[PDB]
Design an enzyme around this catalytic site. Structure first.
Site, PDB file in Angstrom:
ATOM      1  N   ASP A  31       0.783  -1.229   0.000  1.00 20.97           N
ATOM      2  CA  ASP A  31       0.000   0.000   0.000  1.00 20.97           C
ATOM      3  C   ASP A  31       0.827   1.297   0.000  1.00 20.97           C
ATOM      4  OD1 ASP A  31      -1.832   2.039   0.443  1.00 20.97           O
ATOM      5  OD2 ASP A  31      -2.974   0.911   1.930  1.00 20.97           O
ATOM      6  N   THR A  32       1.042   1.884  -1.177  1.00 23.84           N
ATOM      7  CA  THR A  32       1.790   3.137  -1.252  1.00 23.84           C
ATOM      8  C   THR A  32       0.971   4.301  -0.663  1.00 23.84           C
ATOM      9  OG1 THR A  32       0.995   3.587  -3.507  1.00 23.84           O
ATOM     10  CG2 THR A  32       3.066   2.366  -3.279  1.00 23.84           C
ATOM     11  N   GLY A  33      -0.320   4.057  -0.441  1.00 23.99           N
ATOM     12  CA  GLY A  33      -1.185   5.079   0.113  1.00 23.99           C
ATOM     13  C   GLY A  33      -1.260   5.039   1.624  1.00 23.99           C
TER      14      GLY A  33
HETATM   15  C1  LIG Z   1      -3.660   2.752   6.703  1.00 26.51           C
HETATM   16  C2  LIG Z   1      -3.249   4.201   6.521  1.00 26.51           C
HETATM   17  C3  LIG Z   1      -2.201   4.721   7.342  1.00 26.51           C
HETATM   18  O1  LIG Z   1      -1.594   3.880   8.271  1.00 26.51           O
HETATM   19  C4  LIG Z   1      -1.762   6.060   7.234  1.00 26.51           C
HETATM   20  C5  LIG Z   1      -2.356   6.928   6.305  1.00 26.51           C
HETATM   21  C6  LIG Z   1      -3.395   6.433   5.483  1.00 26.51           C
HETATM   22  C7  LIG Z   1      -3.852   5.101   5.570  1.00 26.51           C
HETATM   23  C8  LIG Z   1      -4.928   4.662   4.686  1.00 26.51           C
HETATM   24  O2  LIG Z   1      -6.003   4.222   5.149  1.00 26.51           O
HETATM   25  N1  LIG Z   1      -4.692   4.749   3.326  1.00 26.51           N
HETATM   26  C9  LIG Z   1      -5.752   4.299   2.404  1.00 26.51           C
HETATM   27  C10 LIG Z   1      -5.974   5.458   1.449  1.00 26.51           C
HETATM   28  S1  LIG Z   1      -7.011   6.715   2.212  1.00 26.51           S
HETATM   29  C11 LIG Z   1      -5.940   7.891   2.908  1.00 26.51           C
HETATM   30  C12 LIG Z   1      -6.380   8.521   4.099  1.00 26.51           C
HETATM   31  C13 LIG Z   1      -5.531   9.492   4.689  1.00 26.51           C
HETATM   32  C14 LIG Z   1      -4.286   9.808   4.089  1.00 26.51           C
HETATM   33  C15 LIG Z   1      -3.857   9.170   2.895  1.00 26.51           C
HETATM   34  C16 LIG Z   1      -4.702   8.199   2.301  1.00 26.51           C
HETATM   35  C17 LIG Z   1      -5.180   3.018   1.764  1.00 26.51           C
HETATM   36  O3  LIG Z   1      -4.019   3.313   0.972  1.00 26.51           O
HETATM   37  C18 LIG Z   1      -6.107   2.268   0.786  1.00 26.51           C
HETATM   38  N2  LIG Z   1      -7.038   1.446   1.596  1.00 26.51           N
HETATM   39  C19 LIG Z   1      -6.334   0.125   1.787  1.00 26.51           C
HETATM   40  C20 LIG Z   1      -7.184  -0.832   2.698  1.00 26.51           C
HETATM   41  C21 LIG Z   1      -7.273  -0.270   4.153  1.00 26.51           C
HETATM   42  C22 LIG Z   1      -8.143  -1.297   4.972  1.00 26.51           C
HETATM   43  C23 LIG Z   1      -9.554  -1.433   4.352  1.00 26.51           C
HETATM   44  C24 LIG Z   1      -9.477  -1.968   2.910  1.00 26.51           C
HETATM   45  C25 LIG Z   1      -8.613  -1.048   2.042  1.00 26.51           C
HETATM   46  C26 LIG Z   1      -9.279   0.348   1.808  1.00 26.51           C
HETATM   47  C27 LIG Z   1      -8.376   1.243   0.921  1.00 26.51           C
HETATM   48  C28 LIG Z   1      -9.092   2.549   0.759  1.00 26.51           C
HETATM   49  O4  LIG Z   1      -9.072   3.376   1.686  1.00 26.51           O
HETATM   50  N3  LIG Z   1      -9.699   2.643  -0.453  1.00 26.51           N
HETATM   51  C29 LIG Z   1     -10.502   3.825  -0.944  1.00 26.51           C
HETATM   52  C30 LIG Z   1     -10.993   3.454  -2.373  1.00 26.51           C
HETATM   53  C31 LIG Z   1     -11.745   4.095  -0.036  1.00 26.51           C
HETATM   54  C32 LIG Z   1      -9.604   5.103  -0.937  1.00 26.51           C
END
Ligand SMILES: Cc1c(O)cccc1C(=O)N[C@@H](CSc1ccccc1)[C@H](O)CN1C[C@H]2CCCC[C@H]2C[C@H]1C(=O)NC(C)(C)C
Lengths: 99, 99
Positions: free
Chosen positions: A25-27
């Site tokens: 997960d690059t995000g």
């Molecule tokens: C897990 C995490 C951290 O530890 C630190 C910062 C952010 C995140 C985080 O949740 N990042 C997410 C992007 S949404 C995002 C929110 C805030 C900042 C940057 C990105 C994940 O990369 C992707 N994320 C991976 C994964 C997380 C657990 C639930 C299933 C997927 C949901 C998916 C997701 O959210 N998809 C959408 C289509 C709704 C955007």
């Protein structure tokens, strides 16, 4: 190697003595995993996803095998739908995005 | 280009006649942008992740631009804390993960 994104980039990992499926997960800034037993003392932490923040336990210097490689760093433990390999671990693996 | 992950892989994108900042996310199945005006009709959709689910508007046939390359597909509009370029778009840009 090179991994395409036509499907979720899932890989097998070993953490806390167990084999699991995780998402590259690059995000994600952090590496977060479903409830599991890890050694040492932990620190509280908030991570904000798409639907808001949650609390997770932060363990440091945890060993993890990923792609026939080893990464040793911060691992967050919490009620996460999927196990996530965030940038802190991806960088140890020398991952880059290319296009 | 080649992007390292020491820090968030944020880039400038051209979407909806607008230039915004977004994150290249290999962990995201979909692409979701903060409130923005887009042409065509939409359908409501619920997307979930860390923190819970949010409601978004699903627009199809949307064109986006990143680093001279273009891609077309579905874009979700809603209350997201950061703009996310998901795999539905990353593939079209020929974006891969390398190590
Ligand atoms: C897990 C995490 C951290 O530890 C630190 C910062 C952010 C995140 C985080 O949740 N990042 C997410 C992007 S949404 C995002 C929110 C805030 C900042 C940057 C990105 C994940 O990369 C992707 N994320 C991976 C994964 C997380 C657990 C639930 C299933 C997927 C949901 C998916 C997701 O959210 N998809 C959408 C289509 C709704 C955007």
């Amino acid at each position: 190697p090179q991994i395409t994104l036509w499907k979720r980039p899932l890989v097998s990992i070993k953490v806390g003595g167990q084999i699991k499926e995780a998402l590259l997960d690059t995000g994600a800034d952090d590496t977060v995993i479903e409830e599991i037993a890890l050694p040492g003392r932990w620190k509280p932490k908030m991570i904000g996803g798409i639907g808001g923040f949650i609390k997770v336990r932060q363990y440091d210097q945890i060993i993890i095998e990923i792609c026939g490689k080893k990464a040793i760093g911060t691992v967050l433990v919490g009620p996460t739908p999927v196990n996530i390999i965030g940038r802190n671990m991806l960088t140890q693996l020398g991952c880059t995005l290319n296009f």
